[PDB]
């Protein structure tokens, strides 16, 4: 159940395999990619180096072939991508999407529950 990642913006993110449907019930990687595409200027602007990993960890979640419980990113990955960029959308009449919320994300502190995070 691990298809190779085909979404262009999600190349070089640390992992190369994903599963569908994702949390947003996208049927194919074409459906999700058209929603991640909207962020590629935000990535190119580089308002947050964690924005790259955060989106892909949500739209193209990691598909470990050994391990079959969903691995989400930590809330810290979201809070850095948020506050690092969120002012940019806020200045120009856009808004941090409700899909990219950080509140209910698994914290890095909890030792039971995993969540991906680099630095």
């Amino acid at each position: 159940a691990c298809q190779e990642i085909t979404v262009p913006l999600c190349k070089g993110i640390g992992y190369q395999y994903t599963y569908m449907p994702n949390q947003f019930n996208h049927d194919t990687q074409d459906e999700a990619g058209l929603e991640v595409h909207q962020f590629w200027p935000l990535v190119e602007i580089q308002c947050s180096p964690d924005l790259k990993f955060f989106l892909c960890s949500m739209y193209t979640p990691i598909c470990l072939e050994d391990y079959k419980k969903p691995l989400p990113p930590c809330r810290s990955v979201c809070e850095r991508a948020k506050a690092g960029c969120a002012p940019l959308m806020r200045q120009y009449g856009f808004a941090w999407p409700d899909r990219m919320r950080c509140d209910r994300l698994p914290e890095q502190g909890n030792p039971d529950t995993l969540c991906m995070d680099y630095n």
Partner: antibody
Framework: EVQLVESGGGLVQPGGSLRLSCAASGFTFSSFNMFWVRQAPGKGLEWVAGIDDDGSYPNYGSAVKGRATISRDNSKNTLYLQMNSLRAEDTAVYYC???????????????????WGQGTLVTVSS | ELTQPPSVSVSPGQTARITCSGDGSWCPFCFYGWYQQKPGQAPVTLIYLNNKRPSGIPERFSGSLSGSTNTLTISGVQAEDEADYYCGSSDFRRWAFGGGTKLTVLG
């Protein structure tokens, strides 16, 4: 096959009124945003009016605000543009322009121009 | 507030590159579109969402993004590619178009 036909173009006296109508086909009309873009003869494209899918949030350009009103009626697949107090600087070819693909169920998305009508010339002369 | 070169000259078979960018206040994370206007014809969109081709546009037209600058790339330029190429951008509040670029095919 996407088709956007603009009617109602012709002569309008200065300080007069204008009503344009764009008839859409080949696509689900109510599923895309809709814009008016004009081009004065020999000049560049200029942003005029824009509207959402249902018609709750009209958007207008600088040289147009307060004088124009964009609207749609998704029953007969028609877009409209009304204008008042037309000056000479309003003579232009007026284009009907369809929106491109948008990701559903998200509040973050950007507009694009997917299709253009053939345009109708509006001459502002006495 | 979109700027693009007034004119680009290329030889048949060569590759033309037209650049579009936003000024010191334009939405730096917004997308760029490209529309081709052949003489006397209505505009036709080649590129939307920075590097996407609508159905029917040939694949020799391509878009690329670098910072706040998009580049339209036309490979295998033929004399028929003579046209005005306008770029456009939207920040959800308004639209902004560039002055246009005239493509002349030399020779």
């Amino acid at each position: 096959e996407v088709q956007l036909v603009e009617s109602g173009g012709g002569l309008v006296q200065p300080g007069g009124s204008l009503r344009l109508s764009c008839a859409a086909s080949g696509f689900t009309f109510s599923s895309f945003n809709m814009f008016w873009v004009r081009q004065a003869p020999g000049k560049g494209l200029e942003w005029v009016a824009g509207i959402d899918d249902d018609g709750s949030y009209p958007n207008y350009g600088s040289a147009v605000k307060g004088r124009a009103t964009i609207s749609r009626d998704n029953s007969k697949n028609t877009l409209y543009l009304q204008m008042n107090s037309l000056r000479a600087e309003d003579t232009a070819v007026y284009y009907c322009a369809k929106s491109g693909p948008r990701p559903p169920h998200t509040t973050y998305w950007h507009k694009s121009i997917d299709a253009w009508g053939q345009g109708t010339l509006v001459t502002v002369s006495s | 507030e979109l700027t693009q070169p007034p004119s680009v000259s290329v030889s048949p078979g060569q590759t033309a590159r037209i650049t579009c960018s936003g000024d010191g206040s334009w939405c730096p994370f917004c997308f760029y579109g490209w529309y081709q206007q052949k003489p006397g014809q209505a505009p036709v969109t080649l590129i939307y969402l920075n590097n996407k081709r609508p159905s029917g546009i040939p694949e020799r037209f391509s878009g690329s993004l670098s910072g706040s600058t998009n580049t339209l790339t036309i490979s295998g330029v033929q004399a028929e590619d003579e046209a005005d190429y306008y770029c456009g951008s939207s920040d959800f509040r308004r639209w902004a178009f560039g002055g246009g670029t005239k493509l002349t095919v030399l020779g």
